[PDB]
Amino acid sequence: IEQPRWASKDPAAGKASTPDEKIVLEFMDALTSNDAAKLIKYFAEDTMYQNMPLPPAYGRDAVEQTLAGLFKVMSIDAVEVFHIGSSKGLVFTERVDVLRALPTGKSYNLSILGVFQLTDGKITGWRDYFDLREFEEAVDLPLR
Amino acid sequence: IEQPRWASKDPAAGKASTPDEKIVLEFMDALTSNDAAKLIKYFAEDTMYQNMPLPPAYGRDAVEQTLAGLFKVMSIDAVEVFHIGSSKGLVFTERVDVLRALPTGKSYNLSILGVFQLTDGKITGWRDYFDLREFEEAVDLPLRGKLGPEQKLIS
Ligand SMILES: CCCC[C@@H](O)C(N)=O
Numbered sequence: 001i002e003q004p005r006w007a008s009k010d011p012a013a014g015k016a017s018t019p020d021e022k023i024v025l026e027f028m029d030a031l032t033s034n035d036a037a038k039l040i041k042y043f044a045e046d047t048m049y050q051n052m053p054l055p056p057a058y059g060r061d062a063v064e065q066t067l068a069g070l071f072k073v074m075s076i077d078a079v080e081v082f083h084i085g086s087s088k089g090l091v092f093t094e095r096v097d098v099l100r101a102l103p104t105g106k107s108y109n110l111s112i113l114g115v116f117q118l119t120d121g122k123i124t125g126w127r128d129y130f131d132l133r134e135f136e137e138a139v140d141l142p143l144r
Numbered sequence: 145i146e147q148p149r150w151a152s153k154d155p156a157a158g159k160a161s162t163p164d165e166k167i168v169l170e171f172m173d174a175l176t177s178n179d180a181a182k183l184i185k186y187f188a189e190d191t192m193y194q195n196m197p198l199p200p201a202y203g204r205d206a207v208e209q210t211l212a213g214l215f216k217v218m219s220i221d222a223v224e225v226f227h228i229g230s231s232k233g234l235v236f237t238e239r240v241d242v243l244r245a246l247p248t249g250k251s252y253n254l255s256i257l258g259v260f261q262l263t264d265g266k267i268t269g270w271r272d273y274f275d276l277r278e279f280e281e282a283v284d285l286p287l288r289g290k291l292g293p294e295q296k297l298i299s
């Protein structure tokens with residue numbers, strides 16, 4: 001993953017500056033496990049997950065199942081966070097996830113902006129925004 | 145615009161707490177002008193804009209052209225920011241813009257996560273992330289087929 005032309009040049013732009021930012025970067029590192037049971041440990045009970053072009057999941061079991069499902073069809077091969085910032089209970093990541101569609105073997109660098117809500121270091125919400133059609137077209141797989 | 149089920153409950157979650165956050169919320173208020181010439185005043189020289197499903201625009205004239213082109217076929221009728229946060233030189237907004245397509249009169253509450261890069265309070269980058277197809281289907285217009293080739297001319 002190469003730094004988009006528009007990435008902020010300061011190395012600090014992609015690094016954590018708070019406890020909550022640090023947790024979210026640890027979670028970003030964990031994604032390439034492709035392991036829903038590993039990832040669910042980061043979540044609060046009262047949580048949700050949504051890839052914004054697709055329906056949301058509420059509660060941990062649904063979030064874990066949704067992740068497990070995604071990992072049956074696609075792999076996260078690599079994550080690079082270009083930009084991170086925050087407010088109380090909120091962290092944002094502008095990143096690229098390199099995603100490989102297992103039925104076709106084709107990969108795509110997915111440009112994602114994500115938001116994480118936190119309480120006491122645990123994820124109460126995770127929403128990723130991106131264009132689904134562009135991804136489908138790149139890996140020759142209708143996902144919707 | 146009603147607040148999504150998942151919005152942070154604290155009232156401060158969508159309120160600015162820094163000078164850069166404040167400028168970006170001024171900019172969000174300005175969007176409903178539908179006026180590219182007003183909006184371009186917030187931009188640095190060394191700047192870019194991109195709606196992530198379509199090609200980027202570099203430099204102020206291209207950014208202004210891109211906004212003007214959008215405003216010829218859609219109106220921003222309302223903006224609500226649910227969540228805002230930041231770092232040095234960076235502001236993020238999770239929001240809804242209510243977009244009305246002029247050719248069909250149809251409106252859509254477009255769910256957007258956007259990032260702004262700043263230098264001494266001027267915008268050096270603005271990228272909005274959302275799903276284009278859902279928006280096209282709601283307002284019954286092939287937007288990419290129109291705006292993608294226009295965005296390619298701008299570049
Ligand atoms: C439908 C794309 C889902 C992508 C997700 O597992 C990711 N890379 O965050």
Ligand SMILES: CCCC[C@@H](O)C(N)=O
Nearest residue numbers: 195214220241243256272
């Ligand atoms: C192609 C949709 C662009 C929407 C944009 O003018 C906005 N509301 O940020």
